Structures are given as C-alpha cells and as structure tokens.
Enzyme design. Structure first.
Site, PDB file in Angstrom:
ATOM      1  CD  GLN A  72      -5.946 -18.273 -17.133  1.00 18.34           C
ATOM      2  OE1 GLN A  72      -5.404 -17.773 -16.149  1.00 18.34           O
ATOM      3  NE2 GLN A  72      -7.211 -18.779 -17.097  1.00 18.34           N
ATOM      4  CB  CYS A 122      -6.331 -19.994 -13.650  1.00 20.11           C
ATOM      5  SG  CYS A 122      -8.088 -20.116 -13.070  1.00 20.11           S
ATOM      6  CG  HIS A 176      -7.524 -16.357 -11.284  1.00 15.91           C
ATOM      7  ND1 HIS A 176      -7.336 -17.143 -12.400  1.00 15.91           N
ATOM      8  CD2 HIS A 176      -6.456 -15.527 -11.225  1.00 15.91           C
ATOM      9  CE1 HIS A 176      -6.219 -16.777 -13.011  1.00 15.91           C
ATOM     10  NE2 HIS A 176      -5.658 -15.815 -12.301  1.00 15.91           N
ATOM     11  CG  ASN A 230      -2.654 -13.703 -12.277  1.00 13.27           C
ATOM     12  OD1 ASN A 230      -3.214 -14.643 -12.826  1.00 13.27           O
ATOM     13  ND2 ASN A 230      -3.213 -12.481 -12.198  1.00 13.27           N
TER      14      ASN A 230
END
Ligand SMILES: [Cl-]
Ligand SMILES: [Cl-]
Ligand SMILES: [Cl-]
EC number: 3.4.22.-
Lengths: 173, 109
Positions: A17, A23, A120, A140
């Site tokens: 990303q 996300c 997120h 992540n």
C-alpha cells in the site's frame, strides 16, 4: 529465538500500500489469496468492486466500511463477523490452524479530543512463542514484511513510528 | 514532468502559541517524491489564495499537523516531520477505515 510458529498455510505478501486508502482491500486480498490458495485477489480490484460508480481518478481516496468488509466476504463465500477487542493467543492459534483469516481494525492513538482518529486495517498471519512469550504475527499493508505483537496488548507499534489501537477484528476470511 | 500539488495553508499566527507556529513552519517549502513523480509546494496562504487548506490539529509533541481542503473535506492530510531535509505526507479518509502509507518527500533545494 522462535520456540513455536503457527501461520496461515499459503499467506504471501504480494503487493504494498502506498498513496491510497485501500488498506482493507489489501488486507482482504491477502487473507483471501491465503485461504483460497490463489494470487487472483488484489486491493485495486476489490476497491473497484466496492465502488463501481467512482471515477478512476477518485478511487485512491475511497476507504472501507465494516458492512462492506462483511458483504465483500459473503460474495467470496465467507461468513465474516465482527469481534470486539484483541483475539486471544489460543483463539488465533485455532483459527490459523483451521485456515480462517482475521482482519485487524485499528485506530490511531489520539492526543486529545480535537485530534482526528485515523482508521487502518491490517491482516493477522498467525501466532508464535518467542523468548517464552505469546505473540501474534501480523502484516501491515504499508510494509513488505511481517510484524510481531505481544498477545496481551492492543497497542500496535506500526512502521514510521505510528501507534494504533487494535480495537476489534473481522474474522472469517 | 512531475505533478505539482499546491497546499496553501490558511491560519492566523496571532491565534497560535510560539510552539504551534514553530511546528507549522517545519513544513513550509517545496518537496518531492521520485517514485510517484510528484511534488508539493507548501505555503502560508491567505483568504484570497487558491488551493486553500485549513488546520485541523497541531501536534507539537510529535511534530505533526493535520489539515484538509474545502474541495474535499472527506480526506485528511497528515504531515510528519522526519528530519531537516524530509517530511512524511499521509492521507486518511474521514469516513470509513483507510489511511495511506506515510510518503516521504525530500526538500527541493
Ligand atoms: Cl475522530
Ligand atoms: Cl507561546
Ligand atoms: Cl494563490
């Protein structure tokens, strides 16, 4: 040193990303590619599926709502449900062995009431025992590698020195 | 050629503490990212400026400012100070869950 490692069978980081709010598309795509054993899900296409009307120019700024996380899941043959809080080490262990994907919903740590929260989404990858302590393993979408979380903690120490609170999860991918 | 985004921050210094003003000033200048081929020009504008953005929060403890444009109130910009020649710009959707990677921008000259 790792005493025990338990991760989703076929999980692989395939995309990263950058300058968009996708996300949840990244996280869902990685979890679904893992559980479905494919490489055919990707953030862009998922967000496009979620926002059919939106111009290409404006797609990068589209974010994801909980109802979309559940309904997208359903369209892919998955029964998604929200669970408040951080999942236990034993729950993650079972779900991961059962090839079930967990999406993390996180919110930035806010300094005072006037400081806007940022949302997120991340992907759980499994769990491990490292130096005698229980850990959760996560990805992540900003990153090209995995991260480690103390199972007893909802405070996430993300890259670029950003702290987020893991407030709940969407389980079932 | 690069894409250039003008960010005219509109704010009244008389209303800010010295520390708040010092923090905003960290970001004023011209900055670039080679991977995106994109540049940003951050200035203290005024009420007749084009490309106006207003301040949502100044975080003196973390050297960070959040702001948004009248053109799209649904995107929040977050700038973080990195070092003397670099800042980080991130965007987040005001509604829904979605926040970009911090993007590194290096000082143009
Ligand atoms: Cl808020
Ligand atoms: Cl002062
Ligand atoms: Cl102007």
């Amino acid at each position: 040193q790792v005493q025990y490692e338990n991760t989703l069978k076929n999980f692989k980081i395939r995309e990263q990303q950058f300058d968009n709010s996708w996300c949840a598309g990244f996280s869902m795509a990685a979890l679904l590619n893992a559980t479905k054993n494919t490489d055919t899900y990707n953030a862009h296409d998922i967000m496009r599926t979620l926002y059919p009307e939106v111009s290409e120019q404006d797609l990068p700024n589209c974010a994801t709502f909980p109802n979309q996380m559940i309904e997208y899941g359903k369209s892919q043959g998955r029964d998604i449900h929200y669970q408040e809080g951080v999942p236990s080490y034993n729950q993650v262990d079972q779900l991961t062995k059962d090839n079930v994907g967990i999406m993390i919903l996180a919110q930035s740590v806010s300094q005072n009431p006037n400081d806007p929260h940022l949302g997120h989404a991340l992907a759980v990858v499994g769990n491990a025992k490292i130096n005698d302590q229980e850990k959760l393993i996560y990805w992540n979408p900003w990153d090209t590698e995995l991260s480690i979380q103390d199972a007893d903690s909802s405070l996430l120490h993300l890259s670029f020195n950003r702290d987020y609170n893991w407030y709940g999860s969407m389980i079932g991918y | 050629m690069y894409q250039l985004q003008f960010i005219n921050l509109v704010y009244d210094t008389t209303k800010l503490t010295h520390l708040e003003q010092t923090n905003i000033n960290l970001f004023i200048g011209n900055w670039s990212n080679h991977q995106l081929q994109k540049s940003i020009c951050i200035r203290h504008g005024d009420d007749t400026s084009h490309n106006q953005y207003h301040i949502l929060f100044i975080d003196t403890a973390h050297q960070r400012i959040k702001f948004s444009s009248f053109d799209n109130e649904e995107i929040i910009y977050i700038l973080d100070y990195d070092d003397t020649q670099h800042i980080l710009m991130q965007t987040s959707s005001k509604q829904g869950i979605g926040t970009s990677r911090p993007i590194v921008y290096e000082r143009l000259v």
